[PDB]
Amino acid sequence: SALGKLQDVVNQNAQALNTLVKQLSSNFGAISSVLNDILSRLDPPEAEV
Amino acid sequence: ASVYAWNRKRISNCVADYSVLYNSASFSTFKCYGVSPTKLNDLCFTNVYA
């Protein structure tokens, strides 16, 4: 634990990036979290929503 | 069958042309909810039930 100060910065940056990539898997109330699924499954009037 | 004893048929291991369902004018109501009607020929499904 000698170099903990640098390790905390590296861990925080990696954790922020990891959480940012984890946010792509959430649909946020939509039918799916994948854009390609929405483009392939729906007409534009519901796809825009 | 009647609506209290509605008949459920499994559809599996087939290639399905839904374009003859959209282009047929015999259906008074053809309404899809979770999928576009014109994309049904472009997708693959399993556990299809009628």
- Most B CBs within 10 Å, among A31, A39, A43, to test the B interface: A43
Give the torsion sign (CA, B36, B48, B41, B28): negative
Burial B21-49 (b: 16+ CB within 10 A, else e): eeeeeeeeeeeeeebbeeebeeeeeeeee
Q: Which of B41, B46, B42, B43 is nearest to B23 (CA)?
A: B41
Structure method: cryo-EM
DSSP 8-state secondary structure symbol assigned to residue A34: -
Alpha-carbon span B9 to B46, nearest angstrom: 13
Two structure tokens written together for A36: 């390609």
- Most B CBs within 10 Å, among A36, A37, A38, A40, to test the B interface: A40
Which residues are within 8 A (CB) of A42 and not within 5 positions of it... i.e. 6 or more apart? B35, B36, B39
A24 three-class SS: helix
Alpha-carbon span A39 to B39, nearest angstrom: 10
